[PDB]
Every structure is written in C-alpha cells, then in structure tokens.
Amino acid sequence: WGYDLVHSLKSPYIDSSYRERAEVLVSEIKAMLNPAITGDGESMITPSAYDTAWVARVPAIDGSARPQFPQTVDWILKNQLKDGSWGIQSHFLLSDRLLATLSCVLVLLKWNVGDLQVEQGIEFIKSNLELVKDETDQDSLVTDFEIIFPSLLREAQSLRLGLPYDLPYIHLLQTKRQERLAKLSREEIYAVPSPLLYSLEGIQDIVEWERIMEVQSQDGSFLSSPASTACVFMHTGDAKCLEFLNSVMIKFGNFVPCLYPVDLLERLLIVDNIVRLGIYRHFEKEIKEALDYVYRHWNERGIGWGRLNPIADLETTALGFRLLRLHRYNVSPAIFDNFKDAKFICSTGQFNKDVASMLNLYRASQLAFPGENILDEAKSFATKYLREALEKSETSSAWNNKQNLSQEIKYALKTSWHASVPRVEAKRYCQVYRPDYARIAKCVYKLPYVNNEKFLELGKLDFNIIQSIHQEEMKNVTSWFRDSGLPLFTFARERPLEFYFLVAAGTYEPQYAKCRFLFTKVACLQTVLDDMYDTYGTLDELKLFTEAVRRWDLSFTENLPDYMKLCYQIYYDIVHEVAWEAEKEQGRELVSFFRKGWEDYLLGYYEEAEWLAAEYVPTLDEYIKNGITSIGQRILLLSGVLIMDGQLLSQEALEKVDYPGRRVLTELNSLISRLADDTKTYKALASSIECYMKDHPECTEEEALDHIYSILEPAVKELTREFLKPDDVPFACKKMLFEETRVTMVIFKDGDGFGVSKLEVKDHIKECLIEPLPL
Ligand SMILES: [Cl-]
Ligand SMILES: [Mg+2]
Ligand SMILES: [Mg+2]
Ligand SMILES: [Mg+2]
Predict the structure, then answer these.
(1) Which CATH class for the 1-46+262-465 domain?
(2) Which residues sit with Cβ closer than 5 angstroms to ligand 1, an ion?
(3) Homologous superfamily (CATH) for 466-775
(4) Is the CATH code 1.10.1060.10 the one for domain 47-261?
(5) Which ligand ends up closest to the CA of 676?
(6) How many whole angstroms from its chain centre is CA 660?
(7) Which of 222, 231, 220, 18 is nearest to 106 (CA)?
(8) Please, are residues 193 and 308 in contact by the beta-carbon 8 Å criterion?
(9) Residue 722 alpha carbon to ligand 3 centre in Å
(10) Which of helix, strand or coil describes residue 42?
(11) Known binding positions for Mg(2+)
(12) Cα distance between residue 466 and residue 104, in whole Å
C-alpha cells in the first residue's frame, strides 16, 4: 500500500493506441445508432413468429383464396427451429415456444401448406406440454399467455389436432383465464384504452368488434400489436388496421415483431445503457438527439413505449422521467398521477414488465426535488413492491434465474443513487451488461441497438484506459506527498490515495488531472490541520497559529513552535500554488478570495478549539453554523473546481454555487458532510446529536438522531435540484461539486453511529483505481 503499491502498477492501457482503438469504437457506435435517432431505421427489433403467423392469416383483400401477405407464410415455412418449434434459438422459453408454435401450426393449416412443419410443430407442443408436472415447471410467461393459450388451444381442438387437451396444466390455464376475465370491466374496454387491447386475438368471444374502434391507436394498431390488429382487421375490414399491417411489412419485409413501434422506449434504453456503462461522454450529440425526441412527445398523461400508444406505460414513463431530469430537462413528477387510483397500481401486466416498471419507479423516485411529496410515496410503494417481488416464486423461474433478476432487485434496493461511487457503478455495470439480452412481451425479443457487443467492448476498454491514466496520476501524487514534508506530522495519518479517490472516483475525465491533483494536495494538508486543531495542539499554540493565519507573513512564524513553523510553510505554499493555477485558468485575481476562504475555515477550527478547552457544548444552531465552515469542504471544493481545464467561472457564476450563508452547492455539501459524519460516528468533545439533547433536556437519543436526519434529508433534495437546475454555470463544475458530495455520502452511508469502516474504504480504492477489467 501507499507509495510502493502504486509505483509497482504498470498498466498497458496508457499507450495511445488504446485510445485510438476506442475512438474507432466510438465512430462505429455513432454509425450504428444513426438510423435509430436520426434516420428511419428506428425500432430495430427481432421477428415474432407468433405475430407473423397472425398476419399470415389475413386473406387477400381481393377475395381470392390466398393470404394478403404471402411472404409471411414463406417466412414461417423457412424459419422453423430444429426441434419443431418457432422462436429465437439463442433463448428457450417454454411459454414463448408454445404460443409461437401453436400460432404457426394453425396458420399453415388454414392455407393447407407446410405439412411437415405442422407435423413437427404438433410434436413439439405435445412433447413439451407433457413435461410440465406442476406450476413451478411452467417458467416465465409471455404477455397474456394465460388468456391467449387456452383460446388458441380450443381452436386446435375444433380441428381435432393431436394435442393433450385434457392435461392438468391445461385446466389450470383455463382456471387462470377465467380468473383474469372476472376482474374485467367489459363495458369499459370500448371507452378506456387498456393493456388488454394488446391481446384482442385471445378474447374474440368477448369483444364487440363494432364498438372497439374507439380505442384504436392513431396509426391503426391496437396497442401496437400486429397480431391483435390483424385480428380486428379480419373481423371488421377496417382500413386503418390494414394500413398498420402494411407499414410494418414495408418496414420489416417478410415478418413482424410483437410491438411496433418502440420508438420512445428504445431511445431511452439506448441512453440508459450508454449512461450506466460509463461511456456517455463520447455520445453527447446522440444522447441529446435521442432525449430531445422523447421530450417532444412528453405529455401530462405519461408516455407509452411508442409515441402513438393511447395509454401511458409506467416502465417507459418512469425511465423517461429519470433520464430527462438527469439531463436537465424540465419534468414534473405529477405525471405519476396517471398510474394511481382513488394510490399506485401496476400489479396487472406480465411479471417482468411489472418488475421493470417498479425498478424504474424506484430509481426515478430518488431524483426528488424539495416539496415533491409524490416521489416520497413512489419510493415507499416501489420499495414495498420490490421487497415482495423477492418473495414471489416467479422471481425464481429458470428464465429469471438465468438473468439474475433477484440479484438485480436486491442490488437496486441496497443501492442509493446519492450514496454511489460513479466510476465503480460503471465498472460493475460493464460486468452485468449483456450483449445478447432477451426481453419478454407477447414473445421473446431483442433490441440490438440497446444490447450489443460494441457497447460492452467500448465500456470495458474506456474504463481501463481511464483507470491506467489515474494510476499514473497516483504515482505523481504519492511522489509529491513523499517530498512534501506532510509525512513528518506523525500525529496525523497519511491518506493521500483516499483523498485522491474522493475526487477521481467522480471527476475522472483525462483533461481534469490538475483538478484532481490540487484537490488531493489540499485534502492532505487539511487532515493534518484538523488533527492539529482538534487533537494535538494546545489552545495557546493554536492561538499563535491562528494569528499567523491572519497575517499571511512567512517571517511572522518565528514565534511558532517548530512543528508549526513547518506546518505554516507547507500550508502557505499549497494555498498559493492552488491560487496561481486558479488565476491561470480563470484569468482573474483569486489570491484574496482563497485567503479569505482559508481564514474562515481555520478561524472556525479555532472557535471549536476554544470550545473544547472550555468544555463548552454549543446549541445545535451554533454547532451547525460553526460546523458548516470548519468542516472545510468548502475551501477544499473551491481548490478543485476553479482549476478545471477549460471551465470558466466568473465571480457571478461562482456565487451561484458558492456563497457562505446561502443554500448553494458548496454550503449544502458542507452541511451534508458534517451531519452525515455525525450520524455515521458520534458514538465513537460533542456532536450535533449531543447538542440537540442539551437544547432539549427531555428528548431521547433516538429523537435526537431522528431530528438530525430531518435536517439531512431535505438538504440532499436541495443538493439534487441545485446540481440539475438549468443555469449558465459550466455543468462540469456543478458535476464536480455534486460527485464529490456523492462519494462523501458513500463514505458515511448507513449511520449506526459506530464509526467509519476503514476496511471498506480500501476495497473501494482497489475496485475503482487498482484492478482493471478483464478483456
Ligand atoms: Cl439474456
Ligand atoms: Mg475537527
Ligand atoms: Mg479531527
Ligand atoms: Mg469526527
């Protein structure tokens, strides 16, 4: 550890060829995504054999005895899998194969063709149905399986196909079907668009076709389902229905997907994945183009996965809310009123979709601004839902286990967005992201623009390049620390890597090396100043040191004890090196501004020193006032933020994020740091807890702690708004301040009062800065 560990590191990814390879990946990715955000190749989605077979049913509109779309028949005949089923070969899901195979077998029979495919299709259905012993064996269910399959299977039964119609599992499905159909308002199907419009082909005996057009989508589809739309068409001859089938055939050629379009959801999944992989900074233009389009279609009623959906979708709406707000678009969490009742519902659709909706709601809820009570409710509700989902047997289906759903859920619940290490989360996601990820709706499908090899390849490479660059910086850091004189103060612990990590883990970009470096010097100085003021020094010594702080005269230190003479000199050098760099970057005078900041900080320390010497316990108001200034986060933050390559902060601009006395970014960080620190430790002079109990003699320790959190929680919402707020402050500066707060919040998370876990601090440095991703 320390100097020796760091200088032994030898990362290959520093060589310029790796960055050059990464730039080819970036260009290839932009080319791949171009049709999805700029062109017309939108909605890239795999075939649905099940839906294709429904479209193949439509008889020629000229009245002749052939299909209107004979290419779909040809497709089906040519795409049977080796086991006799239809579906995507890479991923086997019983309900998907059962539904799709029975659908294809029936359409082939209609047109009197593919006798061999039909024979093999029937064998698969019969064979696999007889393997189901109990419920646990059915696996994950595609959308509305319980409703559609009994209906489709009755159709087969009327044709007397050789299927096991009398199996227990079959009877169970009918039972489940009746159960779903009971809670159904029939009269409302025609008045209020609902999830069931996605599967009309499964409830033909219920639907009055002459009334169903009122809930048709503007593009002629029924909830974007080709199968469902085709069904309505054969019953009504509706022209807009036909136009929708035509548009889908024109787009895909000889097949259809199970959802079309998916323009809104797809765009958001692309951005989500790019962001979580840590590679967003390469694709600013594409992310703006994607989100601008989503925002154009953002409305008070929420959004569906496609822009023409007649009803909003919680999964897509919650994802959109989060990404839009995260990217500084103005959205209101009142859109979640659309998914309420007399509160929330979303306990109806297919399981994976329901879980995805609640994960997205849970995540969106963490981006709350002050006074946004509905997000507080959303959080509670989503948390409760997700905790229950873990206890559900569906969560442990073979399919869900293969995708580690329970792990994803558990990880989501233990993960607080505010208390996160950004570089570490991206690293972890590169380890979970799947190029061949399969999703569920009416059938199993993939979105190749969202899930592919290139994303991951760039993700891993980019992470390793960034990390190797940081490893070289850590050599400079440790090299500087060693010759700095700081190691001489043996009453203070040496933590240069921990302070480096504090900034590098959030502000990682290669151009901000000077920012990380100066930040690390100041934090190293501060830990020594801190131990000097609250532990090592005597009041009389500290009065002398505090006086020299006021004078800014090196010659004046002749009065000080030897150890303080040295401390003053290092302090004086570091302050003025930071100042010089800042003036270089900013092009204006900043020495006076920095000196004032250091004065306030250390006078704060001295006031605290006087309190200790007098065994004085301040009121909580006094404690907080002093603690915001003396915790020293402010002057530390300024020492990094004013020296970010190419980021100009006028005085006016700076005062929007730094202004002692106001609730701006640096002030909120100071307050949050002080209190998150107290809540984390305090048990191990006097803290905020102890101060409240002096102010309120009768209150318990529990009441005292609870009150501290009542100050914390609102502060964190304000931090979030100040960060994301639109303004004329360089966003990179705001992000630096925010990300430093986030890493701080990781360090002090879960405040039981015992103290900080030093062992986990090290593990974070290891994961983030030491060990690369395997390629
Ligand atoms: Cl998968
Ligand atoms: Mg202290
Ligand atoms: Mg201390
Ligand atoms: Mg402490």
Answers:
(1) mainly alpha
(2) 437-438
(3) Farnesyl Diphosphate Synthase (1.10.600.10)
(4) no
(5) 4
(6) 32
(7) 231
(8) no
(9) 29
(10) coil
(11) 530, 534, 677, 681
(12) 51
